[PDB]
Structures are given as structure tokens and as C-alpha cells.
Amino acid sequence: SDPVRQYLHEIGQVPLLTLEEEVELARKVEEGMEAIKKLSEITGLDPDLIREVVRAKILGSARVRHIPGLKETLDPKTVEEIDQKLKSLPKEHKRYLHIAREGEAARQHLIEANLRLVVSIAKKYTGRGLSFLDLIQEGNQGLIRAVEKFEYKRRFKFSTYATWWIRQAINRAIADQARTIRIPVHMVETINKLSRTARQLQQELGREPTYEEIAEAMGPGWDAKRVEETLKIAQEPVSLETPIGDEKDSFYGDFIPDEHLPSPVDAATQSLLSEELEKALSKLSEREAMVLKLRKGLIDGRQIENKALRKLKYHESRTRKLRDFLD
Amino acid sequence: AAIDPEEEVIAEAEGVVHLHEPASILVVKARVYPFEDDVEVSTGDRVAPGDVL
DNA sequence: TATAATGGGAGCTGTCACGGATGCAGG
């Protein structure tokens, strides 16, 4: 029925963590990563490889996919090879495997537990050019970043540290994806700053400011030309399907000509030009023909040179009918 | 154990440890197999009846 | 990169008549 209501329902399935549970999960995660570093020191494999194998075993057989970071393809065959090289380690070393496993499980549980926060943060970002669910998803990415970067030692509640990353990712998304013609994030910052400034100036002046007033409130290095060019670059394109008229009848794109494809008169222009040039070249001696046509590129597409130049000056002043092709 | 070293609980002398006042009680339908030395499977592994634990 | 923050929000309301499928109470 409604995707958002369904997601909000699936979110209300996971109960919220008590402080002890939050701390526990965070601790298990951190100690899990430490254990992965340890297993890297022991076996001599890639920390990323070991991490992805542990994760593969925790998630299930459903998810095994090649990771852009890894130096090898990760198939279940390889995850079983690596798992068998991990399990065959001595007991005190094998401990860290279990530690890492429960670490990953704790990570999954921790991410799934805090998903409501992402919703409540993304609900403030509505109508900025991104859909609700998209904001929710990018915010989820922020939440995952938070989980991986969180330190429970500081005795700060996880929502505090997570909120920052969620806002960060949501904003990054809004800046990145909300424009059909992509403008780099810093330039977007510039544009937004310009807009806020203009709104301020217009708020105090009781009227829309000029480019010069904006240049004034912008500070050093800013002039009217830069403001105008920046506002020019901030222009979003318009849809060709934009309705023209009160009815469903015609579209705005039906009034726009194609400036690319030559109209029949243009193809006829090229034809008649090549023809007239070919027929009025009767002056040409053969050597001057091949060499002067190589001069003007009429063959392969790219002293006698001077005599041919002079002869062409001679035949230009002759018929006086080629002016038309010259526009 | 704990964050800061001075918050840790160290046993004075020989004794037995009892756990009281849990924050919550978790009922999981599961079979518990106690072991002694070394375990051949890790957390998350899936096991059919007869597989060595 | 760290006070803590943990389930959205608008809705569009005065047509009309059809084929096909889907469902429920009844013989």
C-alpha cells in the first residue's frame, strides 16, 4: 500500500535498547574489531578479508558478494577456505574468532536498533529535492558510519554521536542528488549562502536587492558579475513535458526546433556549394588542381601554391554569382 | 571489568560467584551443550543434528 | 567526528459506463 508506512512498521518491530544493551553492543563491536586486528596479526591475512569472512558467516549464506575493497573475489568457497584456516588455529587464538563473530552480530543488532532516530532526523529534511525514503536511506548510511566509528568509552549515549553522522549523510545526499545538472558540493554551499544573503538583504530593505547590494553583503572578492554568474549557474532546467494551456493538449517541447539536424535546404546548400565550386574550377591545371585542392583540402579531407592562389583570385572576380553561398 | 581501572571488581580471596538482580531475564528456546576445553564451531554457524560441536 | 535526540504527513472530495476478474452468500 504505502511504502513509508511499511518501513515505519518494520522499524517498530525492533524494540529500543536499554542503556546496558547499548553499552554491551558497542563494547562487543569494538572488541570485535580489535579481535579482527588480532586475527590479522596471527594468521597474516588481510584485516578486510577476515572482517568480510566473519561478516559473511554472521549474515548468512544468502549474502556473499564481491567487495570493491578486497584484493580477491569472495565466493562461499573462499569464505570456507578462510573460515577453515581460522578454525584450525590454537584455542587461545581461536577465541578471537568467536569475539569477532559476536562483534558482527552485535553490530547488526545495534544498527537495526537505532533506525527510528534516522526517521526522526530525516523528517526535518523534507521537500528539499529528495524523497522521504531516500533521506531515510542516506541517514541509514550515516548511522552505519556512526556504529563503525562509535566509542562507548566516552560514556556518551549513542544517539549523540550518531545524530551528527546522520545529518552529515542526509545533507551530503541533498547537496549531491537534488539537481538534474550536477553541481559540486562546495559550489552548492556557495549558492545556498548567496540565497540566504539575498533573503536577508531583501528582508531588511523591503525589496529585492540588486547584484551590487548582494556583492556588498558578500564581502571581499565579490562583485556584481560574480553574483550574476553564480545565480546563472544555479538555474535548474525545465521539463519538456511542462503543460502548455489549460488542457492536456500540447507540451512546451513541441515549440522547440531542432538546431542540430540540417534542414533539406542545408544539405542542398552543401551539395550546391560543392557543385558550383567543382564547375567553376575549370581554370585549374592538373598539378595546380591536385595541389590547390590539397591546399583547401578538397581531396583527402585535409610556388604553384602561389600561382593557384592568384588564379583563384582571378576567377573570384569573374562570374560574381558565388556571393549567395557566402551568407 | 569496566571503563576505568579503579571501577573494576577483583576477588579478594578464593570463593564462588553468584549472580543476583539481573536487569532482565531472556527466555530462548535452545539446547545448551556445556563443554570443557575447545569448541570446533563458532558463533553464527548453522548445525544439523549429529554435527560435532 | 561525541549533552541527548529513537514511527510521516497531507488528503483534493459534483461523470459515467463499460469489461473483466474477483468474492461472497446461497441452492
Added chain:
DNA sequence: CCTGCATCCGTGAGTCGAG
């Protein structure tokens, strides 16, 4: 459980011109 009728859902609803 097979038939029949009630109900829901999707699909249509003139042409050209001008804006």
C-alpha cells in the same frame, strides 16, 4: 463445492486552430 449475482478496478470518453 459449483453456480449465480454483487462489487471492485481499470479503461475509455470527435477534429483542426490558437495560446
